[PDB]
Design a protein around this nucleic acid. Sequence first.
RNA 1: CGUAAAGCGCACGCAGGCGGUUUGUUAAGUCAGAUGUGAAAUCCCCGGGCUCAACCUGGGAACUGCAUCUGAUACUGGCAA
Lengths: 205, 39, 218, 129, 150
Amino acid sequence: ARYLGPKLKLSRREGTDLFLKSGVRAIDTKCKIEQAPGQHGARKPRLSDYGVQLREKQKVRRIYGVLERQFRNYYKEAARLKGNTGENLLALLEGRLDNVVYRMGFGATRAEARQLVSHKAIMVNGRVVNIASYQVSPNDVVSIREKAKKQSRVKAALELAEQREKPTWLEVDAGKMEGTFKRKPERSDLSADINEHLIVELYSK
Amino acid sequence: KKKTTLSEEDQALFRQLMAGTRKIKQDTIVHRPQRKKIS
Amino acid sequence: MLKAGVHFGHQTRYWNPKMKPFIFGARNKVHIINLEKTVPMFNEALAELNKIASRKGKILFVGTKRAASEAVKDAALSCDQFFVNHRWLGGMLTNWKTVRQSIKRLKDLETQSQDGTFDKLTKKEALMRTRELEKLENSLGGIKDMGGLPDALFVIDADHEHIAIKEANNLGIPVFAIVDTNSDPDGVDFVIPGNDDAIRAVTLYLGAVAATVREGRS
Amino acid sequence: SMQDPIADMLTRIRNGQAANKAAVTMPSSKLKVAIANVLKEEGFIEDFKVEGDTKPELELTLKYFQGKAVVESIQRVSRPGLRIYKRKDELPKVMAGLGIAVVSTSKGVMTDRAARQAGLGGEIICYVA
Amino acid sequence: ELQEKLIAVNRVSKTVKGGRIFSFTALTVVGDGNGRVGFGYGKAREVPAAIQKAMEKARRNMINVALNNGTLQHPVKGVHTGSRVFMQPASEGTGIIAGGAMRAVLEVAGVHNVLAKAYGSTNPINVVRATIDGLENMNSPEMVAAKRGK
RNA sequence: CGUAAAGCGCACGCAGGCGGUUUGUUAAGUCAGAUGUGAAAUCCCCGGGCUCAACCUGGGAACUGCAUCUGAUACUGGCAA
């Protein structure tokens, strides 16, 4: 029900940093990125069309830490909502509670944020939410409880929040350790390199 | 504006010179190529 | 621009229905072109053809049938322009690349011929080489000093020289043809309903065209 | 025998556009003049003219924009073998609105735009694309 | 800004005097990403010479398409030899959802989000030829209004 | 549906299907509106409650239909010329 394995291996099959070990240090430096996703990893794949579509879907799931039935349900919900299904799908992945806890700098990675969410260290709107996939509405206040406030992790995580780009659709404020999800993220406000038409076309075959 | 040309009466005279009844009047659809761009 | 003239149309046989707008068509089984339609057509051809001739362009007269020769050599060569008067090689426009190196061999062999080593080392091979200059000279005659592919094309018979029209349409070159009642206005951009095989008609005709070419800005 | 004179009219116009014909004559009727008035109104033909006294003859002066022909594809929809009667909601648009569909409504012979604006459906005669 | 991609390579044969002789055919489509689609066939004795002749023929013989915002305009049907092909503008009907060998020509064509369904034969050499014929005889609201007056 | 499977060996013709052209009437088909009905749940939309989701639920849309009444009369049908 979640991955639990070598993370930088997943980041190495995709060829791109999936932010799976954000943590203390800088850019990887001990990953052997691009070089060998397994034993025959030095081989160029010469990847197919199914391979590029598949590999795009796997990039997105392995970023946000979602498995397939849950992702597939996000595609059905993004499909039925009015508008653009790629952009709706990223809006559904960005409203996840573990993601919003990661974006605010409360967790160093999304797995650490998922353990903060999971171990009842996070309230939304003054109610404790235990669930990684809670869908944070706009104009909500998500914060850390009094237990697990001033624990080392979150402090260190806010320390590495300043190294990243400070997302526009949040009120990050780390003094009180509370945040406000203000609006839904625009497609132009996130990541610029994921090709969601490939995963629309992957599920539409 | 029509280009300078021999008079219509003159054209009729040319038609008159034409030996025999000497008139062709087949009517068909006409297609004209678009003018080439100056650039 | 109008002179009483002698051709009045021809070709009883193999007439083409696409020439139906241009036919007066009465006498003795033969078709008469409506020359009252030809005169505006031919004045238009002189208009756009003088327009590209004044932009310093290359015209390429095409005269394979007889006696369009040496009338196309006389008319093209009366201007500072180019011509094909013998068999038009299939693909001297659309692969001009390979025809470029054949023209290069014509230049190298005439430079070798009248100046350099022509009497050198053999009589038989020298005769062989000279008749290579007759073959490359009559096939690649006018076009040998062109150095580009031309900015217009003026063919003297549309059905007899359908290959050149087909290539100049393939390459986006304006084709200026004197069609007859057997010919077809394929991709001829400036059709002229005339007479293709009368020497009076083609010398009058090329006389007018060569007259309007040699007026650039001057 | 002739059993659909409307499809015969549209056949005359398809084969006149296809043969670069300047004008097209046929026997005339009230429905053909109604359709022809819709075609002139929507810009697919240049003009029409009904002549004769005891045997009327409709004549359509056709249009050609460039060398190409204006009437790109005219189809007969409600043929006699199977008639097609659409409501004001079921009333189709042809080439996503770029091409009218001549519907015979109770108010008269109209287009799809004009009869969807008039709020009433009817018998859809032909697609002009 | 050329955006080339190959669809199909095959091994054809000839059967001369002494055994058979095997040649390779490419089939590529180039296009800028805003109209301007071409395809080229090209055949040669090895595969990279085949694809190079295919690209070189496809860079010329390139056709304009009157796109909409990012997509087609009206639903269009193009046919070639045995291969009948439907397309539907799918006004932001997200993603190019076309068959194989039609996804590629629609991809480099610059269209983004149409709905397709090839019928009949679906030989790749004839399913393009039935997409260009198709995208070629698809005309825009400023062309139809040019034709018919307004 | 010439050659891949597929045009009766050819005709005449009943029931059936289709039917040139003009005017008038009808309004059966057709179209428009109204009313009654088309159970509730389910699907769809906008919301609400279970920490979320599945789930439950409020309101709507829908149920492409049928019947009746009111109209329109271009096309098809009936009738008369």
